[PDB]
Protein backbone atom coordinates (compact mmCIF):
# COMPACT_ATOMS: atom_id res chain seq x y z
CA UNK A 1 0.00 0.00 0.00
CA UNK A 2 1.08 3.60 -0.74
CA UNK A 3 0.59 6.62 1.56
CA UNK A 4 -1.68 9.59 0.54
CA UNK A 5 0.28 11.89 -1.82
CA UNK A 6 -0.27 15.09 0.15
CA UNK A 7 1.84 18.27 -0.25
CA UNK A 8 4.32 17.12 2.45
CA UNK A 9 4.91 13.80 0.55
CA UNK A 10 5.39 15.57 -2.81
CA UNK A 11 7.94 17.91 -1.19
CA UNK A 12 9.86 14.93 0.23
CA UNK A 13 10.40 13.74 -3.39
CA UNK A 14 11.76 17.21 -4.32
CA UNK A 15 14.34 17.01 -1.50
CA UNK A 16 15.43 13.51 -2.64
CA UNK A 17 15.57 14.64 -6.32
CA UNK A 18 17.68 17.65 -5.28
CA UNK A 19 20.21 15.26 -3.60
CA UNK A 20 20.31 13.13 -6.77
CA UNK A 21 20.96 16.22 -9.00
CA UNK A 22 23.79 17.37 -6.64
CA UNK A 23 25.39 13.89 -6.67
CA UNK A 24 25.14 13.84 -10.50
CA UNK A 25 26.80 17.29 -10.80
CA UNK A 26 30.13 15.91 -9.42
CA UNK A 27 32.82 16.81 -11.99
CA UNK A 28 34.42 13.35 -11.52
CA UNK A 29 31.36 11.70 -13.13
CA UNK A 30 31.87 13.42 -16.55
CA UNK A 31 28.15 12.76 -17.14
CA UNK A 32 27.34 13.29 -20.83
CA UNK A 33 24.56 15.67 -21.94
CA UNK A 34 22.55 13.20 -24.01
CA UNK A 35 19.12 11.68 -23.39
CA UNK A 36 18.25 10.39 -20.86
CA UNK A 37 20.01 13.25 -18.99
CA UNK A 38 19.15 13.13 -15.33
CA UNK A 39 20.26 16.82 -14.88
CA UNK A 40 17.43 17.91 -17.24
CA UNK A 41 14.85 15.24 -16.29
CA UNK A 42 14.75 15.81 -12.49
CA UNK A 43 14.30 19.65 -12.73
CA UNK A 44 11.58 19.00 -15.40
CA UNK A 45 9.89 16.47 -13.05
CA UNK A 46 9.89 19.08 -10.22
CA UNK A 47 8.38 21.62 -12.71
CA UNK A 48 5.55 19.25 -13.72
CA UNK A 49 4.82 18.48 -10.04
CA UNK A 50 4.75 22.25 -9.32
CA UNK A 51 2.26 22.65 -12.24
CA UNK A 52 -0.02 19.88 -10.84
CA UNK A 53 0.02 21.59 -7.41
CA UNK A 54 -0.90 24.91 -9.05
CA UNK A 55 -4.03 23.29 -10.62
CA UNK A 56 -5.23 21.60 -7.42
CA UNK A 57 -5.35 25.16 -5.96
CA UNK A 58 -7.50 24.62 -2.80
CA UNK A 59 -7.84 22.17 0.15
CA UNK A 60 -10.73 20.23 -1.52
CA UNK A 61 -8.77 19.74 -4.78
CA UNK A 62 -5.58 18.85 -2.84
CA UNK A 63 -7.49 16.19 -0.89
CA UNK A 64 -8.79 14.63 -4.17
CA UNK A 65 -5.26 14.77 -5.73
CA UNK A 66 -3.71 13.13 -2.64
CA UNK A 67 -6.05 10.08 -2.94
CA UNK A 68 -5.74 9.58 -6.74
CA UNK A 69 -4.58 5.93 -7.24
CA UNK A 70 -2.15 6.76 -10.06
CA UNK A 71 -0.69 9.84 -8.29
CA UNK A 72 -0.08 7.85 -5.07
CA UNK A 73 1.78 5.17 -7.04
CA UNK A 74 3.73 7.75 -9.06
CA UNK A 75 4.93 9.66 -5.94
CA UNK A 76 5.78 6.40 -4.14
CA UNK A 77 7.80 5.23 -7.20
CA UNK A 78 9.59 8.59 -7.55
CA UNK A 79 10.53 8.46 -3.83
CA UNK A 80 11.86 4.87 -4.22
CA UNK A 81 13.81 5.51 -7.42
CA UNK A 82 15.38 8.73 -5.99
CA UNK A 83 16.35 6.83 -2.80
CA UNK A 84 17.78 4.07 -5.03
CA UNK A 85 19.92 6.60 -6.96
CA UNK A 86 21.29 8.01 -3.64
CA UNK A 87 22.06 4.44 -2.46
CA UNK A 88 23.78 3.76 -5.82
CA UNK A 89 26.31 6.56 -5.12
CA UNK A 90 26.66 5.51 -1.40
CA UNK A 91 27.51 1.88 -2.28
CA UNK A 92 29.24 2.57 -5.65
CA UNK A 93 31.84 4.97 -4.22
CA UNK A 94 34.78 5.48 -6.75
CA UNK A 95 33.21 3.08 -9.30
CA UNK A 96 30.69 5.88 -10.06
CA UNK A 97 33.64 7.71 -11.75
CA UNK A 98 34.37 4.81 -14.15
CA UNK A 99 32.04 5.20 -17.13
CA UNK A 100 32.14 1.41 -17.94
CA UNK A 101 31.35 0.18 -14.39
CA UNK A 102 28.19 -1.81 -13.59
CA UNK A 103 27.36 1.02 -11.08
CA UNK A 104 27.38 3.59 -13.96
CA UNK A 105 25.35 1.18 -16.12
CA UNK A 106 22.79 1.11 -13.22
CA UNK A 107 22.73 4.94 -13.20
CA UNK A 108 21.80 4.76 -16.94
CA UNK A 109 18.96 2.32 -16.10
CA UNK A 110 17.68 4.80 -13.46
CA UNK A 111 18.04 7.77 -15.89
CA UNK A 112 15.87 5.89 -18.43
CA UNK A 113 13.28 5.17 -15.68
CA UNK A 114 13.18 8.84 -14.63
CA UNK A 115 12.79 9.87 -18.30
CA UNK A 116 9.86 7.41 -18.77
CA UNK A 117 8.19 8.53 -15.50
CA UNK A 118 8.35 12.17 -16.66
CA UNK A 119 6.76 11.22 -20.03
CA UNK A 120 4.10 9.22 -18.13
CA UNK A 121 3.12 12.01 -15.67
CA UNK A 122 2.93 14.50 -18.57
CA UNK A 123 0.55 12.16 -20.45
CA UNK A 124 -1.63 11.31 -17.40
CA UNK A 125 -1.69 14.88 -15.99
CA UNK A 126 -1.55 16.96 -19.22
CA UNK A 127 -1.29 20.67 -18.30
CA UNK A 128 -1.24 19.55 -14.63
CA UNK A 129 -4.79 18.13 -14.59
CA UNK A 130 -5.63 14.41 -14.13
CA UNK A 131 -7.00 12.79 -17.30
CA UNK A 132 -5.98 9.12 -16.69
CA UNK A 133 -9.59 7.91 -16.63
CA UNK A 134 -10.15 9.54 -20.10
CA UNK A 135 -6.84 8.35 -21.64
CA UNK A 136 -7.17 7.62 -25.36
CA UNK A 137 -5.31 4.43 -26.33
CA UNK A 138 -4.14 4.89 -29.98
CA UNK A 139 -5.15 1.39 -31.16
CA UNK A 140 -8.91 0.68 -30.67
CA UNK A 141 -8.50 -3.15 -30.52
CA UNK A 142 -5.88 -2.71 -27.74
CA UNK A 143 -8.15 -0.09 -26.05
CA UNK A 144 -11.05 -2.68 -26.05
CA UNK A 145 -8.77 -5.17 -24.18
CA UNK A 146 -7.83 -2.56 -21.51
CA UNK A 147 -11.50 -1.49 -21.06
CA UNK A 148 -12.68 -5.11 -20.86
CA UNK A 149 -10.24 -6.26 -18.15
CA UNK A 150 -9.51 -3.00 -16.34
CA UNK A 151 -12.39 -0.62 -17.16
CA UNK A 152 -11.38 2.99 -16.67
CA UNK A 153 -8.33 2.23 -14.45
CA UNK A 154 -5.29 4.38 -15.19
CA UNK A 155 -2.88 1.78 -13.66
CA UNK A 156 -2.94 -1.92 -12.66
CA UNK A 157 -0.47 -4.26 -10.94
CA UNK A 158 1.82 -6.20 -13.36
CA UNK A 159 0.56 -9.51 -11.79
CA UNK A 160 -3.10 -8.71 -12.81
CA UNK A 161 -2.09 -7.30 -16.23
CA UNK A 162 -0.04 -10.42 -17.15
CA UNK A 163 -2.82 -12.85 -16.13
CA UNK A 164 -5.37 -10.90 -18.17
CA UNK A 165 -3.09 -10.56 -21.22
CA UNK A 166 -2.54 -14.34 -21.11
CA UNK A 167 -6.32 -14.86 -21.58
CA UNK A 168 -6.04 -13.22 -25.04
CA UNK A 169 -2.38 -13.82 -26.06
CA UNK A 170 -0.78 -16.83 -24.35
CA UNK A 171 2.60 -16.32 -22.66
CA UNK A 172 4.46 -19.65 -22.79
CA UNK A 173 7.05 -19.34 -19.98
CA UNK A 174 8.21 -17.42 -16.93
CA UNK A 175 11.22 -16.09 -18.85
CA UNK A 176 8.98 -14.84 -21.67
CA UNK A 177 6.70 -13.12 -19.10
CA UNK A 178 9.84 -11.60 -17.46
CA UNK A 179 11.08 -10.22 -20.86
CA UNK A 180 7.51 -8.91 -21.49
CA UNK A 181 7.39 -7.13 -18.08
CA UNK A 182 10.80 -5.51 -18.84
CA UNK A 183 9.39 -4.28 -22.18
CA UNK A 184 6.05 -2.84 -20.90
CA UNK A 185 6.84 -1.77 -17.31
CA UNK A 186 9.18 1.02 -18.51
CA UNK A 187 8.92 2.84 -15.13
CA UNK A 188 10.08 -0.38 -13.37
CA UNK A 189 7.50 0.01 -10.59
CA UNK A 190 5.69 -3.42 -10.94
CA UNK A 191 2.58 -1.62 -12.35
CA UNK A 192 1.34 -1.17 -15.95
CA UNK A 193 -0.14 2.31 -16.58
CA UNK A 194 -2.57 2.90 -19.52
CA UNK A 195 0.28 5.10 -20.95
CA UNK A 196 2.80 2.19 -20.80
CA UNK A 197 0.13 -0.04 -22.41
CA UNK A 198 -0.43 2.59 -25.17
CA UNK A 199 3.35 2.72 -25.93
CA UNK A 200 3.69 -1.10 -26.09
CA UNK A 201 0.60 -1.58 -28.35
CA UNK A 202 1.71 1.23 -30.72
CA UNK A 203 5.19 -0.31 -31.08
CA UNK A 204 4.11 -3.90 -31.55
CA UNK A 205 0.83 -3.44 -33.46
CA UNK A 206 -1.29 -5.08 -34.82
CA UNK A 207 -2.86 -6.16 -31.51
CA UNK A 208 -4.15 -9.45 -33.00
CA UNK A 209 -0.59 -10.85 -33.21
CA UNK A 210 1.15 -8.51 -30.70
CA UNK A 211 3.27 -11.14 -28.89
CA UNK A 212 4.47 -12.66 -32.21
CA UNK A 213 5.44 -9.13 -33.43
CA UNK A 214 7.28 -8.49 -30.14
CA UNK A 215 9.08 -11.86 -29.93
CA UNK A 216 10.20 -11.50 -33.59
CA UNK A 217 11.05 -7.72 -33.81
CA UNK A 218 12.45 -7.06 -30.33
CA UNK A 219 13.63 -10.33 -28.79
CA UNK A 220 15.21 -12.11 -31.79
CA UNK A 221 15.64 -9.63 -34.73
CA UNK A 222 19.32 -8.59 -35.28
CA UNK A 223 18.33 -5.04 -36.35
CA UNK A 224 16.77 -4.28 -32.92
CA UNK A 225 18.88 -1.84 -30.86
CA UNK A 226 16.66 -1.00 -27.85
CA UNK A 227 16.91 2.71 -26.60
CA UNK A 228 19.56 4.60 -28.58
CA UNK A 229 20.27 8.25 -29.27
CA UNK A 230 20.97 9.26 -32.92
CA UNK A 231 24.72 9.59 -31.99
CA UNK A 232 24.57 5.92 -30.90
CA UNK A 233 22.76 4.88 -34.13
CA UNK A 234 25.55 6.57 -36.18
CA UNK A 235 28.22 4.86 -34.04
CA UNK A 236 26.58 1.46 -34.61
CA UNK A 237 26.18 1.94 -38.40
CA UNK A 238 29.49 3.76 -39.07
CA UNK A 239 31.37 0.46 -39.64
CA UNK A 240 28.86 -0.40 -42.40
CA UNK A 241 29.03 2.97 -44.19
CA UNK A 242 30.59 1.14 -47.22
CA UNK A 243 27.64 -1.37 -47.27
CA UNK A 244 24.51 0.53 -48.45
CA UNK A 245 21.32 -1.11 -47.15
CA UNK A 246 22.82 -1.78 -43.68
CA UNK A 247 20.13 -0.78 -41.10
CA UNK A 248 19.01 -0.90 -37.51
CA UNK A 249 15.82 0.15 -35.66
CA UNK A 250 15.71 1.76 -32.23
CA UNK A 251 13.47 3.16 -29.53
CA UNK A 252 13.90 6.74 -28.40
CA UNK A 253 13.42 7.97 -24.86
CA UNK A 254 12.26 11.37 -26.37
CA UNK A 255 9.77 9.78 -28.86
CA UNK A 256 8.04 7.06 -26.85
CA UNK A 257 5.84 4.63 -28.78
CA UNK A 258 7.60 5.18 -32.12
CA UNK A 259 10.38 3.38 -33.96
CA UNK A 260 13.28 5.10 -35.74
CA UNK A 261 15.05 3.18 -38.54
CA UNK A 262 18.64 4.24 -39.21
CA UNK A 263 20.14 3.10 -42.53
CA UNK A 264 23.15 3.49 -44.81
CA UNK A 265 22.38 5.23 -48.15
CA UNK A 266 23.94 4.43 -51.54
CA UNK A 267 26.34 7.37 -51.04
CA UNK A 268 27.58 6.14 -47.63
CA UNK A 269 25.58 8.51 -45.42
CA UNK A 270 23.56 7.38 -42.40
CA UNK A 271 19.94 8.64 -42.44
CA UNK A 272 16.80 7.77 -40.50
CA UNK A 273 13.05 7.38 -41.11
CA UNK A 274 10.23 7.37 -38.52
CA UNK A 275 7.51 5.04 -39.85
CA UNK A 276 4.05 6.73 -39.84
CA UNK A 277 1.77 4.87 -37.16
CA UNK A 278 1.96 1.62 -39.20
CA UNK A 279 3.39 -1.82 -38.18
CA UNK A 280 7.21 -1.88 -38.06
CA UNK A 281 7.34 -5.17 -40.03
CA UNK A 282 5.43 -3.50 -42.89
CA UNK A 283 7.93 -0.58 -42.99
CA UNK A 284 10.82 -3.12 -42.96
CA UNK A 285 9.23 -5.29 -45.71
CA UNK A 286 8.53 -2.21 -47.89
CA UNK A 287 12.01 -0.85 -47.28
CA UNK A 288 13.58 -4.20 -48.17
CA UNK A 289 11.58 -4.34 -51.48
CA UNK A 290 12.66 -0.80 -52.32
CA UNK A 291 16.34 -1.73 -51.66
CA UNK A 292 16.84 0.46 -48.56
CA UNK A 293 16.76 -2.06 -45.66
CA UNK A 294 18.86 -5.09 -46.61
CA UNK A 295 21.41 -5.92 -43.91
CA UNK A 296 20.22 -5.70 -40.28
CA UNK A 297 23.16 -4.49 -38.11
CA UNK A 298 25.24 -5.03 -41.32
CA UNK A 299 24.50 -8.79 -41.37
CA UNK A 300 24.40 -10.81 -44.63
CA UNK A 301 21.03 -12.35 -43.73
CA UNK A 302 17.83 -10.34 -43.46
CA UNK A 303 15.07 -12.30 -41.66
CA UNK A 304 11.92 -12.91 -43.71
CA UNK A 305 9.10 -10.96 -41.96
CA UNK A 306 6.23 -11.88 -44.33
CA UNK A 307 4.97 -14.50 -41.85
CA UNK A 308 3.88 -11.49 -39.68
CA UNK A 309 1.46 -10.31 -42.45
CA UNK A 310 -0.64 -13.55 -42.05
CA UNK A 311 10.99 -19.71 -32.00
CA UNK A 312 12.67 -18.07 -28.95
CA UNK A 313 15.26 -19.74 -26.73
CA UNK A 314 15.47 -19.30 -22.95
CA UNK A 315 19.01 -17.78 -23.59
CA UNK A 316 17.50 -15.23 -26.04
CA UNK A 317 15.03 -14.05 -23.31
CA UNK A 318 17.87 -13.94 -20.75
CA UNK A 319 20.09 -11.79 -23.04
CA UNK A 320 17.13 -9.48 -23.83
CA UNK A 321 16.51 -8.93 -20.07
CA UNK A 322 20.11 -7.80 -19.29
CA UNK A 323 19.34 -4.10 -19.91
CA UNK A 324 16.20 -4.23 -17.78
CA UNK A 325 15.55 -4.27 -14.01
CA UNK A 326 14.03 -7.72 -13.45
CA UNK A 327 16.72 -9.52 -11.38
CA UNK A 328 14.46 -9.24 -8.29
CA UNK A 329 11.55 -11.07 -9.98
CA UNK A 330 10.99 -14.79 -9.47
CA UNK A 331 11.91 -16.49 -12.76
CA UNK A 332 9.47 -19.37 -12.21
CA UNK A 333 6.19 -17.34 -11.97
CA UNK A 334 7.39 -13.88 -13.18
CA UNK A 335 4.75 -12.33 -10.86
CA UNK A 336 6.25 -12.30 -7.33
CA UNK A 337 9.66 -11.03 -6.24
CA UNK A 338 12.36 -13.43 -5.07
CA UNK A 339 12.02 -13.76 -1.28
CA UNK A 340 13.77 -17.10 -0.44
CA UNK A 341 17.34 -18.36 -0.89
CA UNK A 342 18.14 -22.11 -1.04
CA UNK A 343 21.23 -23.47 0.69
CA UNK A 344 23.75 -24.57 -0.42
CA UNK A 345 23.16 -23.85 -4.15
CA UNK A 346 22.13 -20.20 -3.50
CA UNK A 347 19.28 -20.17 -6.06
CA UNK A 348 16.60 -17.52 -5.39
CA UNK A 349 12.83 -17.63 -6.06
CA UNK A 350 9.51 -16.71 -4.37
CA UNK A 351 8.30 -18.88 -1.46
CA UNK A 352 5.03 -19.66 -3.30
CA UNK A 353 7.00 -21.32 -6.18
CA UNK A 354 9.33 -23.19 -3.88
CA UNK A 355 6.33 -24.48 -1.83
CA UNK A 356 4.52 -25.61 -5.02
CA UNK A 357 7.67 -27.50 -6.14
CA UNK A 358 8.12 -29.15 -2.70
CA UNK A 359 4.39 -30.06 -2.53
CA UNK A 360 4.80 -31.80 -5.96
CA UNK A 361 7.62 -34.02 -4.55
CA UNK A 362 9.98 -32.19 -6.95
CA UNK A 363 13.61 -33.21 -6.53
CA UNK A 364 15.55 -30.64 -4.45
CA UNK A 365 16.04 -27.12 -5.79
CA UNK A 366 13.55 -26.27 -8.62
CA UNK A 367 16.48 -25.00 -10.74
CA UNK A 368 19.46 -27.31 -10.13
CA UNK A 369 17.74 -30.27 -8.36
CA UNK A 370 20.41 -30.31 -5.60
CA UNK A 371 19.36 -31.32 -2.04
CA UNK A 372 17.91 -28.41 -0.06
CA UNK A 373 19.81 -28.24 3.22
CA UNK A 374 18.13 -25.01 4.32
CA UNK A 375 16.27 -21.95 3.18
CA UNK A 376 16.52 -18.32 4.25
CA UNK A 377 14.16 -15.36 3.69
CA UNK A 378 15.86 -12.67 1.56
CA UNK A 379 15.19 -9.25 -0.06
CA UNK A 380 16.47 -8.89 -3.62
CA UNK A 381 17.23 -5.55 -5.29
CA UNK A 382 17.05 -5.19 -9.12
CA UNK A 383 20.78 -4.13 -9.04
CA UNK A 384 22.02 -7.11 -6.89
C1 LIG B 1 22.39 1.91 -25.01
C2 LIG B 1 21.61 1.35 -23.86
C3 LIG B 1 20.26 1.07 -23.96
C4 LIG B 1 19.63 0.56 -22.84
C5 LIG B 1 18.16 0.22 -22.87
O6 LIG B 1 17.49 0.32 -23.90
N7 LIG B 1 17.69 -0.21 -21.68
C8 LIG B 1 16.47 -0.84 -21.37
C9 LIG B 1 16.03 -0.69 -20.06
C10 LIG B 1 14.84 -1.28 -19.66
C11 LIG B 1 14.09 -2.00 -20.57
C12 LIG B 1 14.51 -2.16 -21.88
C13 LIG B 1 13.67 -2.97 -22.87
C14 LIG B 1 12.45 -2.18 -23.32
C15 LIG B 1 13.28 -4.31 -22.23
C16 LIG B 1 14.51 -5.16 -21.98
N17 LIG B 1 15.35 -5.17 -23.18
C18 LIG B 1 15.33 -4.28 -24.17
O19 LIG B 1 16.03 -4.33 -25.15
O20 LIG B 1 14.46 -3.23 -24.08
C21 LIG B 1 15.71 -1.57 -22.28
N22 LIG B 1 20.28 0.34 -21.69
C23 LIG B 1 21.58 0.64 -21.67
C24 LIG B 1 22.27 0.37 -20.37
C25 LIG B 1 21.75 -0.72 -19.47
C26 LIG B 1 21.56 0.69 -19.08
N27 LIG B 1 22.29 1.14 -22.71
NA1 LIG C 1 5.32 0.65 -14.72
ZN1 LIG D 1 7.63 -17.46 -8.08
ZN1 LIG E 1 19.65 -24.66 -6.88
Hey, which of 103, 117, 199, 226 would you mutate to test ligand 1's pocket, going by the most ligand atoms within 8 Å of its Cβ? 226
Report the DSSP pairing between strands 348-349 and 270-273.
unpaired
Closest ligand 1 atom, residue 106 Cα: 26
> Does residue 223 form part of some domain?
no
CATH number of 382's domain: 3.30.40.10
- How far is the centre of ligand 1, averaged over its atoms, from the C-alpha of 226 (Å)? 6
> Does residue 316 form part of some domain?
no
Cα–Cα distances (Å) from 35 to 108, 174, 298, in that order, read: 10, 32, 25
Burial of 103 (0-12, 13-18, 19+ CB in 10 A): middle
User: Same domain for 24 and 100?
Assistant: yes
Experimental method: X-ray
Number of domains in the chain: 4
Pocket flag, ligand 1, residue 108 (CB < 6 Å): yes
CATH number of 274's domain: 3.30.505.10
- How far is the centre of ligand 3, averaged over its atoms, from the C-alpha of 178 (Å)? 11
- How far is the centre of ligand 3, averaged over its atoms, from the C-alpha of 235 (Å)? 40
**Residues 299, 251 contacting (CB under 8 angstroms):** no
User: Same domain for 82 and 105?
Assistant: yes
User: Same domain for 102 and 149?
Assistant: no
What residues contact residue 149 under an 8 Å CB cut-off, 6+ apart? 164, 167
List the Cα angle 87/90/92 in 5-degree steps: 100
User: Same domain for 198 and 266?
Assistant: no
Pocket flag, ligand 1, residue 183 (CB < 6 Å): yes
Pocket flag, ligand 1, residue 29 (CB < 6 Å): no
User: Same domain for 175 and 62?
Assistant: no
| Helix ranges, the chain (H) | 7-24, 38-55, 59-66, 69-92, 102-124, 140-150, 158-166, 174-184, 194-203, 210-214, 230-237, 280-289, 314-321, 351-359
Cα-trace Rg, the chain: 22
Q: Residues with Cβ within 5 Å of ion ligand 4? A: 345, 347, 365, 367-368
- How far is the centre of ligand 4, averaged over its atoms, from the C-alpha of 326 (Å)? 19
Cα–Cα distances (Å) from 133 to 52, 64, 287, 375, in that order, read: 16, 14, 39, 44
Q: Which domain holds residue 372?
A: 327-384
- Which ligand is nearest the CA of 332, by number? 3
> Does residue 312 form part of some domain?
no
Amino acid sequence: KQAAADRRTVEKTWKLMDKVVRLCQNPKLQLKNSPPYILDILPDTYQHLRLILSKYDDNQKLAQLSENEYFKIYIDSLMKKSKRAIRLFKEGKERMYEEQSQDRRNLTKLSLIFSHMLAEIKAIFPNGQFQGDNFRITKADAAEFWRKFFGDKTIVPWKVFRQCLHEVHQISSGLEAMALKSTIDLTCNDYISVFEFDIFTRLFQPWGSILRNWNFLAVTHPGYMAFLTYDEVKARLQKYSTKPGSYIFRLSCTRLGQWAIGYVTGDGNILQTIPHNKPLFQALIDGSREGFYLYPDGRSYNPDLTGLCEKVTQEQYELYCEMGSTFQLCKICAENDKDVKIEPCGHLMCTSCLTAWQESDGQGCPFCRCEIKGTEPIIVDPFD
